[PDB]
Design a protein around this motif. Sequence first.
Motif, mmCIF file in Angstrom:
data_model
loop_
_atom_site.group_PDB
_atom_site.id
_atom_site.type_symbol
_atom_site.label_atom_id
_atom_site.label_comp_id
_atom_site.label_asym_id
_atom_site.label_seq_id
_atom_site.Cartn_x
_atom_site.Cartn_y
_atom_site.Cartn_z
ATOM 1 N N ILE A 21 0.840 -1.185 0.000
ATOM 2 C CA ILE A 21 0.000 0.000 0.000
ATOM 3 C C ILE A 21 0.885 1.249 0.000
ATOM 4 O O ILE A 21 0.864 2.029 -0.950
ATOM 5 N N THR A 22 1.644 1.397 1.077
ATOM 6 C CA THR A 22 2.535 2.537 1.213
ATOM 7 C C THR A 22 3.198 2.858 -0.128
ATOM 8 O O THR A 22 3.194 4.007 -0.568
ATOM 9 N N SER A 23 3.752 1.822 -0.741
ATOM 10 C CA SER A 23 4.418 1.979 -2.022
ATOM 11 C C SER A 23 3.457 2.596 -3.040
ATOM 12 O O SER A 23 3.763 3.623 -3.644
ATOM 13 N N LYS A 24 2.315 1.945 -3.198
ATOM 14 C CA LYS A 24 1.307 2.417 -4.131
ATOM 15 C C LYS A 24 0.933 3.859 -3.785
ATOM 16 O O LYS A 24 0.666 4.665 -4.676
ATOM 17 N N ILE A 25 0.928 4.142 -2.491
ATOM 18 C CA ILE A 25 0.591 5.473 -2.017
ATOM 19 C C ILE A 25 1.637 6.469 -2.525
ATOM 20 O O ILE A 25 1.310 7.617 -2.826
ATOM 21 N N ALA A 26 2.870 5.994 -2.604
ATOM 22 C CA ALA A 26 3.965 6.829 -3.070
ATOM 23 C C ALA A 26 3.946 6.881 -4.599
ATOM 24 O O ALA A 26 4.632 7.703 -5.204
ATOM 25 N N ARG A 27 3.152 5.994 -5.179
ATOM 26 C CA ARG A 27 3.035 5.927 -6.626
ATOM 27 C C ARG A 27 1.815 6.722 -7.096
ATOM 28 O O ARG A 27 1.734 7.111 -8.260
ATOM 29 N N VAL A 28 0.897 6.942 -6.166
ATOM 30 C CA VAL A 28 -0.315 7.683 -6.470
ATOM 31 C C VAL A 28 0.058 9.010 -7.134
ATOM 32 O O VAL A 28 -0.473 9.351 -8.190
#
Length: 102
Positions: A21-28
């Motif tokens: 998630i965190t990663s994806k959040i940083a990818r958002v």
Amino acid sequence: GSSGSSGEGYEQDFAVLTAEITSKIARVPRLPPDEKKQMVANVEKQLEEARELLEQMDLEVREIPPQSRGMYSNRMRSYKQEMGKLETDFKRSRIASGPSSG
């Protein structure tokens, strides 16, 4: 015949989630408006999916003895911290309208 499934564990999963998630959040803030829209939602699921965990984990660690609770506690605090944060960094990522320096 040949089928079955039996795998216990919570932290592991969650951990993976929070991470993924965190990663994806940083990818958002690094994703297009075609993948972001969905992404911002994909995280909403993985998030809520982990939200219950903290609930189950906490609703479990309770019954857990003071001889096992070990670590779990120190972690419980960590997770929460992150989790709650994930709910922030997540919104603080989707609020990105491009590069957004600073």
